[PDB]
Subunit: 201 residues, 6 copies
Amino acid sequence: CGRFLRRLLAEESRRSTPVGRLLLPVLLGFRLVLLAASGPGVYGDEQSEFVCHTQQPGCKAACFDAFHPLSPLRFWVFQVILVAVPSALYMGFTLYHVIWHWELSGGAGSLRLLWAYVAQLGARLVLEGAALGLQYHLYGFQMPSSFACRREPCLGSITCNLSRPSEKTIFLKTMFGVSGFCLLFTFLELVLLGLGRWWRT
Amino acid sequence: CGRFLRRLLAEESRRSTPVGRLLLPVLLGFRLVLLAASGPGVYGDEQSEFVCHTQQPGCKAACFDAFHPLSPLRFWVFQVILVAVPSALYMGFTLYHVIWHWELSGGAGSLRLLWAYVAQLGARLVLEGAALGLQYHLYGFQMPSSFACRREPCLGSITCNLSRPSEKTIFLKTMFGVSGFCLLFTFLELVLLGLGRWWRT
Amino acid sequence: CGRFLRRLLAEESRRSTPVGRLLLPVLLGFRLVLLAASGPGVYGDEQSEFVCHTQQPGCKAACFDAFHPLSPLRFWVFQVILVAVPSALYMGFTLYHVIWHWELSGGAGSLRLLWAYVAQLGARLVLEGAALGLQYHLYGFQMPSSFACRREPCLGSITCNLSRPSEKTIFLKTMFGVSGFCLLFTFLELVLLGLGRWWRT
Amino acid sequence: CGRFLRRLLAEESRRSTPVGRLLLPVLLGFRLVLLAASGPGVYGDEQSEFVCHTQQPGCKAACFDAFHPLSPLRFWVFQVILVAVPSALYMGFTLYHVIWHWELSGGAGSLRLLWAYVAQLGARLVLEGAALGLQYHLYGFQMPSSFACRREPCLGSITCNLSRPSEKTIFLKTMFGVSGFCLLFTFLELVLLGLGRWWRT
Amino acid sequence: CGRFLRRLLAEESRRSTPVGRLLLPVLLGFRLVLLAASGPGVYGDEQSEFVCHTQQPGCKAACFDAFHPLSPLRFWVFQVILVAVPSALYMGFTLYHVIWHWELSGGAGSLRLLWAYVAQLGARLVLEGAALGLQYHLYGFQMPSSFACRREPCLGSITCNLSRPSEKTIFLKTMFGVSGFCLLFTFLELVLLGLGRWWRT
Amino acid sequence: CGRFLRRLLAEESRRSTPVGRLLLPVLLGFRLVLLAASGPGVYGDEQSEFVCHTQQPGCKAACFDAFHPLSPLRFWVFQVILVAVPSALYMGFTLYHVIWHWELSGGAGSLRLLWAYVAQLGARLVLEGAALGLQYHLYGFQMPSSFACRREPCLGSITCNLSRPSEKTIFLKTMFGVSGFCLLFTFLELVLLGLGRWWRT
Ligand SMILES: CCCCCCCCCCC(CCCCCCCCCC)(CO[C@H]1O[C@@H](CO)[C@H](O[C@@H]2O[C@@H](CO)[C@H](O)[C@@H](O)[C@@H]2O)[C@@H](O)[C@@H]1O)CO[C@H]1O[C@@H](CO)[C@H](O[C@@H]2O[C@@H](CO)[C@H](O)[C@@H](O)[C@@H]2O)[C@@H](O)[C@H]1O
Ligand SMILES: CCCCCCCCCCC(CCCCCCCCCC)(CO[C@H]1O[C@@H](CO)[C@H](O[C@@H]2O[C@@H](CO)[C@H](O)[C@@H](O)[C@@H]2O)[C@@H](O)[C@@H]1O)CO[C@H]1O[C@@H](CO)[C@H](O[C@@H]2O[C@@H](CO)[C@H](O)[C@@H](O)[C@@H]2O)[C@@H](O)[C@H]1O
Ligand SMILES: CCCCCCCCCCC(CCCCCCCCCC)(CO[C@H]1O[C@@H](CO)[C@H](O[C@@H]2O[C@@H](CO)[C@H](O)[C@@H](O)[C@@H]2O)[C@@H](O)[C@@H]1O)CO[C@H]1O[C@@H](CO)[C@H](O[C@@H]2O[C@@H](CO)[C@H](O)[C@@H](O)[C@@H]2O)[C@@H](O)[C@H]1O
Ligand SMILES: CCCCCCCCCCC(CCCCCCCCCC)(CO[C@H]1O[C@@H](CO)[C@H](O[C@@H]2O[C@@H](CO)[C@H](O)[C@@H](O)[C@@H]2O)[C@@H](O)[C@@H]1O)CO[C@H]1O[C@@H](CO)[C@H](O[C@@H]2O[C@@H](CO)[C@H](O)[C@@H](O)[C@@H]2O)[C@@H](O)[C@H]1O
Ligand SMILES: CCCCCCCCCCC(CCCCCCCCCC)(CO[C@H]1O[C@@H](CO)[C@H](O[C@@H]2O[C@@H](CO)[C@H](O)[C@@H](O)[C@@H]2O)[C@@H](O)[C@@H]1O)CO[C@H]1O[C@@H](CO)[C@H](O[C@@H]2O[C@@H](CO)[C@H](O)[C@@H](O)[C@@H]2O)[C@@H](O)[C@H]1O
Ligand SMILES: CCCCCCCCCCC(CCCCCCCCCC)(CO[C@H]1O[C@@H](CO)[C@H](O[C@@H]2O[C@@H](CO)[C@H](O)[C@@H](O)[C@@H]2O)[C@@H](O)[C@@H]1O)CO[C@H]1O[C@@H](CO)[C@H](O[C@@H]2O[C@@H](CO)[C@H](O)[C@@H](O)[C@@H]2O)[C@@H](O)[C@H]1O
Ligand SMILES: [Ca+2]
Ligand SMILES: [Ca+2]
Ligand SMILES: [Ca+2]
Ligand SMILES: [Ca+2]
Ligand SMILES: [Ca+2]
Ligand SMILES: [Ca+2]
């Protein structure tokens, strides 16, 4: 029915501010739609866009494995589903809380939902921060046009060339920014609930 | 229910004129359906449609990266999701405004929605205008049939040929026009709310 | 709810005859399903089905660009979305008209919807007629099996062969017919509303 | 609502027998699901499965165009949408008939729906019969393993070989049978309404 | 509505036992999801995975046509839609039975549904049994790694090799088992309704 | 309706703890979304990523069949549908239990649902445990970069190289972990219902 959904949305947004009510959900949906629409077009053909000037058998696969042990498309999919796990638990915890109290009325129980909201914001802050650092550690801010490889079974130094480095750099920097703003407004929502004075006392 | 949706549509369209109520939404949906249906068919195979008459390793990827640092398909996807961000915030701000005032009645509060409507039109005017200028700056109005390239690792001047320049020019000019009409009627909707006299006083 | 939809359909079909109530919508849906299901199978591989007997670099792309500056698949997609634009505006204009008059009652206002219905039929007649003429001007009624090309950078006269001309001719003639019947019954619906005597007086 | 749909189904099935109420709709859905699931797998790669033992330019496309001017996949799509056109008109004619008589009560009008039901069965009998004859005239009952071709620009007699003739013959015979049973039970439904005595008097 | 569906499910499951109420529907859905998800990955590229060591034109297509006149993917699609035909007729026969008796009350009629339930179980037993025997007759229990071919236009004995025989054998045996359990519990549901004593008297 | 679903969720979650109410469903959905989104990208092209340095006909297919008799993508699809079978039976058993007791009231019957919940957790523990052991037995924890093959029709020892071993090892270890946590919290949910004292007495 429609009177149950108006209670599910009003209870899940009673403690938050407009930063968590509107801005964060739109930022997280913006990131997902962008990855789904444009991601495969930029990084989907990474293996065929990696050309090494050699003929020894097995050398091209050894050099590509050293350059990228994990593709950005796999990294970003894992990020978006991990960050969604704390929110799925909180929405489920709110769903059953409304079902069971409907059946007795048509603070002590309303306060346990506040601790649940503070806890999933804290988990998201730690997950968003560790993902940004891992992203910088793996890929950096720029994708090169060449790559020098020295490994077995290659004999000597092998030079390999990449395709579309400018477009890949642009998409990389765009995702660092969208993720950086998600972290900032997750921290700001905690400050406005009173984290400034909690850490003091 | 159906009586809640009749209030959500009536409140979200109380301040607008027929230009913003009917014409703008149909223009923006028209642009999205056109890009989804025809876009990949015209620009999807840009890399394979770029033939350079050379044999040096790495030269074809260097010349294509100089010609297009960003494909039109990626540019237009970013435009349509950015312009949707101000409208998603306004529709969410209206959704919660209706939920909370249902629960007390079955100007001062109706006026804050007017400032929200004026503000997302202003943000869309700035986003639509900057996108048109960037589009003209990157691609122009015409797609050539040839391209001269002088860069490393290419030795000398390399001539490259493109496929389907007429069909690409037609689709480019069509999108500049659909976007140009979106900007005009976003400006006209502000004038009819009283922007002519606001800037005066 | 279900009592709102019974009013939306009854008001949007009060002035029309059975030609506009049943026959035109089925004809327009028939055209869309046919293009979606069979279109890509007949015209999707046009570029690979165009073989020119030459070896000069750049000549095959120059001759194909002269033969088809616009593919039929792109032309027909643009036709079906343009013709839908007048109907989307009329259905939206009817939606809000029902929402606002529900809220005061649970001719002068019913007559403005008649002018809106006459106006979108007139716009569709002009759009359907101009599209048929453009179709005949671009493609004709028959797709050839060969094509002579004389353009730069080709040296001399180049002969190119096409694949599946019979199946392409059949699909072309079928779409001219389905579109021709859409035009006829759009004109007949205006005559039955009284266009015969309007143009007289 | 759910009380409107119970009236839409009861009125659309008041005059029919169990042959038209259950058996015909299941037979027509069975044919559509079979074509969608298995059709592209059997006939989708017809062009690449047609090998001619020659080297003259243009000869392979001339011989394939003579063998199949229309693919079975295109023929069967056109059949299923044509046969659906009489049923879409009848269901629409019943929808508006229920909407307008709801609004006056919460034989002469019930009898006009009988003529509409008899008329769409008659149109389906003519469309189903003409399609079966056209199918036999175009393809037959068997798909060969070889094909002799004598046409320009081929010099002499050219022999071409086909792939998977057994699987194509099986799918062809299966569709003739499913369509043949659709025709039989469309004729039987007319006989049970009284066509035996109508043609007499 | 929701009170109509609670009657549609209660009437369609009044005569059955837990074997037909829960176990059979889950077994049949399990088979469909498995075929849709994994089937194309194992058998989709059968033609390209069939390598014959020859050069005569037309010999490879003649040998593959002898080995498989019907692919397992086409056989299993036909099985799952045939077995669904008796259940679609019974669910439709129950739908109209509930619609018409709602309209007179808000054994003799409840008993005709028992004969309908016994009859579709009997039809499914015959269809499931004939499909298992046909499957064993066509494919067996094992897919070989080689194949000897002696047919026109091949000159002599031709040896052909197959790819992935172990994975194909595993998927074949799995489907024989899932289908074998469907047959067993269709027979057991008839025994529990009283088939043991019916065949006696 | 919405009052029926609030009873279906309240009855299906009356006996469980928060471990089974929230955590297990989110873990199992997390695994499915990850396999659907990223799985084909990592393992989809396994056959083309397997290069053997030979020329004898039939040797490459013999060595690949020995290395992988079953792909991980097929193994993981079978795991997720098997583990879902006990939950589908329990949800169906709860659905009919609510339908039939609605129709008599608007412990002995509530206790039979407890045995059903304990039984599907036990079946899932056995299925999850046997799948983990089979996974370790088939693939291990690491995917190599090379493979030595000695089988007919290969003459001698053949060395084959694999592509992307690092990314495949990462995805393999990730799925062992997600499945290992599913097993742990299925065992913990039984302990909290009283399995510690049941096995004692
Ligand atoms: C109304 C006034 C408006 C004024 C606008 C000022 C703004 C300037 C825009 C700057 C920008 C916007 C990209 C769009 C991003 C949108 C974000 C959304 C993304 C979607 C999710 C494109 O702008 C450039 O476009 C060029 C087009 O070729 C122009 O070329 C000239 O003019 C043309 C004119 O027609 C002529 O035709 C053309 O012949 C001329 O040569 C340049 O003049 C112009 O600066 C990005 O600049 C890019 O520059 C390249 C250079 O190297 C960078 O490459 C880096 O170095 C490589 C070599 O070491 C490495 O190999 C590579 O690894 C690395 O990348 C890129 O990294 C990036 O920085
Ligand atoms: C009832 C009376 C109706 C009267 C109609 C008058 C209207 C005229 C229409 C004009 C238009 C409509 C395109 C449809 C757009 C729809 C928009 C929706 C888009 C979907 C989202 C096609 O019209 C042309 O079609 C030609 C077909 O080949 C005709 O060819 C002749 O007649 C045939 C007859 O059969 C014969 O067969 C055929 O052999 C004859 O040669 C021309 O006569 C005709 O003008 C576009 O014109 C195009 O011309 C080309 C020329 O160069 C332009 O190329 C440019 O220059 C290149 C070389 O430098 C560059 O390389 C290229 O980069 C650049 O592009 C294009 O840019 C574009 O301007
Ligand atoms: C129960 C009695 C029923 C009597 C039926 C009478 C009706 C006749 C039907 C006519 C029709 C229906 C197509 C279906 C359209 C459905 C529309 C829905 C479309 C789906 C959206 C096919 O009918 C033809 O089919 C042939 C099959 O090959 C038959 O071949 C013979 O018999 C076989 C017998 O088995 C033998 O096997 C076979 O060996 C025999 O050779 C012909 O006899 C028969 O006329 C179309 O005819 C076509 O003819 C070709 C000839 O050229 C036309 O080609 C044109 O010229 C080319 C060369 O210049 C150009 O290159 C090309 O550009 C151009 O096209 C086509 O344009 C088109 O006109
Ligand atoms: C429990 C007892 C059950 C008794 C069952 C009796 C029923 C017999 C079934 C008959 C049927 C069912 C197809 C399934 C249809 C399902 C419909 C649903 C479709 C899905 C929508 C397959 O049955 C055949 O299968 C063969 C497999 O190869 C068997 O081969 C042997 O035994 C194996 C044993 O293991 C050995 O392994 C194997 O080595 C042995 O050689 C045959 O013995 C058997 O008759 C179809 O028969 C087919 O035969 C071929 C012959 O030519 C026909 O080819 C035609 O001629 C060509 C050459 O001129 C042309 O080129 C071609 O154009 C044309 O086609 C086909 O047209 C078709 O008639
Ligand atoms: C915790 C204790 C748990 C104990 C577990 C005991 C259970 C044993 C499992 C048995 C099974 C499970 C398949 C999963 C089925 C899941 C069903 C769901 C399907 C999804 C819908 C795989 O198990 C095998 O896997 C091998 C992996 O290569 C192992 O190889 C060794 O150990 C590795 C260790 O690491 C080393 O690495 C590796 O180097 C070692 O060589 C074997 O030891 C092991 O038996 C299937 O066995 C298979 O064997 C092959 C042999 O031929 C059969 O091939 C047949 O003959 C061919 C040649 O004539 C034909 O050409 C072919 O046509 C035909 O097929 C197959 O038919 C099938 O029978
Ligand atoms: C803010 C501080 C944060 C500190 C972070 C510390 C954490 C360290 C992370 C470790 C990790 C995270 C992978 C992400 C997993 C996410 C899980 C979700 C999955 C999605 C579902 C990547 O981390 C490595 O990335 C390298 C990038 O190349 C770096 O390279 C250097 O630095 C660069 C710097 O720029 C330079 O550019 C670059 O030139 C430098 O060379 C390394 O320094 C770094 O350790 C995985 O490590 C991997 O190492 C390889 C080595 O062999 C392992 O290969 C194994 O051996 C092969 C040869 O025998 C076998 O062939 C192969 O079979 C086997 O695999 C892998 O197995 C795996 O263990
Ligand atoms: Ca680029
Ligand atoms: Ca063109
Ligand atoms: Ca043809
Ligand atoms: Ca075959
Ligand atoms: Ca295998
Ligand atoms: Ca890797």
